[PDB]
Paper text:
[name] is the [name]/VirB11-like ATPase that powers T4aP depolymerisation. PilB is the ATPase that powers pilin polymerization in the T4aP. T4aP polymers can be rapidly depolymerized at the base, resulting in fiber retraction. Adjacent packing units adopt one of two conformations: open (O) or closed (C).
Therefore, to crystallize PilTGm in the absence of added nucleotide without reductive methylation, we extensively optimized the buffer (see the “Methods” section). The resulting crystals diffracted to 3.0 Å, and the structure was solved by molecular replacement with the entire hexamer present in the asymmetric unit. This structure was approximately C3 symmetric with alternating open- and closed interfaces, similar to the methylated OCOCOC [name] structure. However, small deviations make this structure pseudo-C3 symmetric. Although a nucleotide was not added, density consistent with ADP allowed the nucleotide with partial occupancy to be modeled in all nucleotide-binding sites. These nucleotides were likely carried over from Escherichia coli during protein purification. The isomorphic low-occupancy and high-occupancy ADP OCOCOC [name] structures have an RMSDCα of 0.6 Å per hexamer. The RMSDCα of these two structures with the methylated OCOCOC [name] structure is 1.9 Å per hexamer. In the ADP-bound OCOCOC PilTGm structures, the estimated occupancy of ADP was similar in the open- and closed interfaces. The three OCOCOC [name] structures described here are the only examples of [name] in this conformation determined to date.
Author numbering:
A (entry chain C): 2 to 353
B (entry chain B): 1 to 353
C (entry chain A): -1 to 353
D (entry chain D): 110 to 237
Write the structure that this text describes.
Amino acid sequence: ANMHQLLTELVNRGGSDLHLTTNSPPQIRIDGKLLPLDMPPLNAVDTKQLCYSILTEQQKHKFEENNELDLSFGIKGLSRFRGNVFVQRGAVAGVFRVIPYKILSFEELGLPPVVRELAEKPRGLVLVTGPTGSGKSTTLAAIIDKINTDRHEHIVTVEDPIEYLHPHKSCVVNQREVGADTKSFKNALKYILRQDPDVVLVGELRDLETIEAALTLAETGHLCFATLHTNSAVQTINRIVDVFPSYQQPQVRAQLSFVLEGVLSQTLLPKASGTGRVLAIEVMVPNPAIRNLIREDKIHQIYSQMQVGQEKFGMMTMNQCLYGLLQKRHITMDVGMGRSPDPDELKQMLTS
Amino acid sequence: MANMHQLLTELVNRGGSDLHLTTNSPPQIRIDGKLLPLDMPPLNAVDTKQLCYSILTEQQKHKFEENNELDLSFGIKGLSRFRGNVFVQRGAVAGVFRVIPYKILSFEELGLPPVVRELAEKPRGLVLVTGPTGSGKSTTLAAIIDKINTDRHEHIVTVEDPIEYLHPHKSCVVNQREVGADTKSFKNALKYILRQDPDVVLVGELRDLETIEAALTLAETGHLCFATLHTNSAVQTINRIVDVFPSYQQPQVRAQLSFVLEGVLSQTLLPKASGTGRVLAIEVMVPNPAIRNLIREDKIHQIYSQMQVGQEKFGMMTMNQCLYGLLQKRHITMDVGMGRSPDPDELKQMLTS
Amino acid sequence: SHMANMHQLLTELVNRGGSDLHLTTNSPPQIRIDGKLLPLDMPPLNAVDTKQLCYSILTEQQKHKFEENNELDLSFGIKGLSRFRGNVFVQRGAVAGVFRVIPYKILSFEELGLPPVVRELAEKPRGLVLVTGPTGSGKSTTLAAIIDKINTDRHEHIVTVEDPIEYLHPHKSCVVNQREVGADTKSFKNALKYILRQDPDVVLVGELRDLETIEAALTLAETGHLCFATLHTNSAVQTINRIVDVFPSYQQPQVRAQLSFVLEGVLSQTLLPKASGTGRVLAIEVMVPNPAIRNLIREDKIHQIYSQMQVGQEKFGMMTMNQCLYGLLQKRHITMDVGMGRSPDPDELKQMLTS
Amino acid sequence: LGLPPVVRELAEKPRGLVLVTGPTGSGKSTTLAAIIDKINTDRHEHIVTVEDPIEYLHPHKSCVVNQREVGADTKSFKNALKYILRQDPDVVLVGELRDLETIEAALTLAETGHLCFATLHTNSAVQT
Ligand SMILES: Nc1ncnc2c1ncn2[C@@H]1O[C@H](COP(=O)(O)OP(=O)(O)O)[C@@H](O)[C@H]1O
Ligand SMILES: Nc1ncnc2c1ncn2[C@@H]1O[C@H](COP(=O)(O)OP(=O)(O)O)[C@@H](O)[C@H]1O
Ligand SMILES: Nc1ncnc2c1ncn2[C@@H]1O[C@H](COP(=O)(O)OP(=O)(O)O)[C@@H](O)[C@H]1O
Ligand SMILES: Nc1ncnc2c1ncn2[C@@H]1O[C@H](COP(=O)(O)OP(=O)(O)O)[C@@H](O)[C@H]1O
């Protein structure tokens, strides 16, 4: 009955994570920063009692065998949660994440209209990138949900774990969870071409084999969605090419020039109001000039090409996005400057 | 049990640096660099085993008997924490014990340049602190961790073998996992670290292939990762990390390294010209756009050329540039500066201009 | 009675100054004196004899281990006599054994024929000192004399890693810890993995078998410690080349730079039969690095180091092998054939004789 | 399929190694099915295919056609190829030349008077 109250406080306060460890009060991450609750500090008896209060008997066994445990659980009327229990300095510790279920609209997410146009693409590779917790899964869920609403096609997702659930609308939606429904990303992608897909979500471009799978899907007539942890379009494109040996990079660059349809690099920044976060996003939509630049190995010039395609194609550099957020007073100058990849350009952009 | 308490108490009270326990000698304490025997009868093999085992857990006893080697740390309430090494010689247990101070020195007390303070403010990336064993790496890391703890409202996780410096919660939540007790291994701790909502992670030495991938993944997914190696320069550090991997996977490591590297600090402690104490010599590499491309393009030899002229703007500093400054302040001798220069000819050119 | 024979055979080995006792079937017991085997005046042994004699000095666990593998290395003491290193094996279906003497008494520098510059090496605060030569060329005896001088004079921590431990060093002014590979520590690599956490001042690492041991020895010497190691090389230049050339070409520049800073002495030894026909006398090449030699190492001009050694005798206590053979020849300790048979350049030694 | 006339003449070769290469989904299996079907139609020989998985089925025409699917009919390419010389083949499809062992099987089949078909993921004759 105490663990219930703590998870209730986490939800009510709009927090993302609950942390339980000795010699500190419970702490909740809100808008990316930890805030301690107005409670006495926990001891080792407390952390074990609190964490064990949400475990099954079999789960207590596995944790004591390894001093590690991953799990998920639900609290009726509240939310499901992702938990990790571990041991530090001889005492139990726990971290508990909230599992969103409701898909927000493109405008609630702060996504510009061009992202809505990406859900209509018949084939190609669309990459959504950024750091952990930069909105990638929510953006993807909005795109996938629009396809589910609008098309009569087959969507297959491979996820680790599944985050957002897509009940069938006009599409048939099959969602495979790594570690339960399928052994691995590699095994799921081995059979995906024999599963008659139209739209496939493959997750992060972790290694060479998954990149070849996404390029093959995109060039064989499918719309393929994937993620990377990179922070810009140029940085994203380089990270796909540079994984391959020098001798095979020309083909990958040629493949990317044909199948790439969009790169979205996101980051959530604290709002100037002090409550909540706002999306900063760089949007690159390839035009003929950029596709040629990829093939000719002149990737360093793509940023300059993005600078002049805003009105026509819906492109937007990070700095142009930061410029709009600064003009609307959604973020502070220090936050905007802190994320600008070129503060001198943004300063020029602000005073021009 | 209550005897080992007394020997460690005498070690601290007497200002010793190290306590030595071995057979056919009384306990000896190193004072001002030289060993002094305590006024006690010589120890036998029963004594050394009992004394060393009195400060061990059952897990630690088993692991020592499995390997005949053991590093560990422990605390004596009201006195101090200590680092221990237990080993076997001539069929008998032996032990050496160092003191671990409660107070973490500041960047200025440690002789660290202002760029090290700015590394403690990095919101993401990979920072490497390198050098041989006992070259000051843990002391520098403790200063960095403590500043983040003071200044940020974030989650710091350390995996250590063993834990040396303890970081009670300040503004951060700090969790410290000791290998062999809190967690089975580095591999196991890093397998779950990504589900523990960390912001800053200390992973220890990049001792094998699997830990580097864990450290690279942590750094590229938006976390600040600190790690150590045994190397003496930025180029040796960068080369050592990529080349340990099979040739076909080095491209990904180079792309990853070019993206996540935020600083490499290579340290060595040198004797002070006064003859008492040591002074820090440090090579600092801070990646600029030019350097990140060279890592990505497998042009490591050109990384060194970029470092000689970026000193004033970003706080970068080659070892030779640091040695030049130590020589100008007359903190070190010519033999020491030349004896640690990776290119004495370059240092000669800087001196005679 | 079997034990009483093994004791008498091992006692005879010590009183007659033999180095090794050999027991095998169809031969009498034989003892090695000054490198050459001599049979004792006894009937030849059979398989019953060799098994009983060798087993008389083994523990029950050692007999069991021997019977599982047909191999056994061990050390043991005979109260009032000496300690010994034994190996028992099987040949032609019968037990055989070899037993070496481990002397209790370390001889002094002058008794061993070591020049005074070797005494000064025991006073070095840090660096790498290499003692090289073939098997049984006196390397361990020289190292024990140096370590004994450190043990006597300093209040520091000496750690040895040995395969196996030969000379035992009681604590004198130093604290001496000696780790035997295969019993005290799993391997040289594992012992060296922890040596920096054991607060050493002086470390003996044994033979520079592999890259990891060379890197460990260079690190010890770079971090302010005095490190002793051995190789099987016959000259200073050959020794330096052996260390550098085991590394890949791309990392050899650093090794040469490292060696040039930390190297403090190279001793290459060989024991030669005396002219009188009894005993052996030490011939030694001694290299003590000066600023000129350290540069030759960094510049990859290794083979030019010998010319520097020819002229550093009076100033730095240096000495080439040929300079040593000259002194043994003028004092008539060795014959002309023995001295010439070992000169790396007999024509140079010839010129030194006629001058 | 848009294959030039020289491809039909390759289907008449009595022996040797024929490689059909390209990236995934570039038509390789379809081209190979056209070649095998002509052989099945034209020859009185024994065709064995090893496939992971089987993509095109060939009912017997003038040839005897045996098709082994990895993971069901046979444990692996390695296991199927160890016995193929003892199965009296004339034409063999071995799939992708993924490792050194499979290449040696294809070169040996092609050298001992058999017609061997295999694929690679290379993009040109020289690269292949
Ligand atoms: N564009 C966005 N605008 C507003 N809130 C967002 C946005 N994206 C994500 N969020 C919220 O912040 C959290 C982080 O999003 P997430 O899907 O986990 O990104 P990632 O998968 O990259 O970690 C989400 O749970 C969501 O509630
Ligand atoms: N810049 C420094 N100035 C003075 N003392 C230092 C300095 N750096 C390290 N030390 C001292 O060195 C000793 C051991 O350092 P340590 O953390 O073990 O380095 P490492 O783990 O890399 O070998 C510590 O007691 C520390 O006080
Ligand atoms: N300089 C020396 N002078 C006289 N006798 C020596 C000398 N060095 C060694 N001896 C004797 O010769 C024997 C063989 O030498 P040893 O220590 O086995 O050399 P190594 O270390 O190369 O194996 C020793 O037992 C020792 O008693
Ligand atoms: N010459 C061709 N012309 C048009 N479509 C083709 C052709 N060859 C194959 N296809 C179709 O393209 C898809 C992929 O071809 P596939 O035979 O699977 O090539 P691969 O075995 O190299 O991956 C198939 O489903 C097929 O129907």
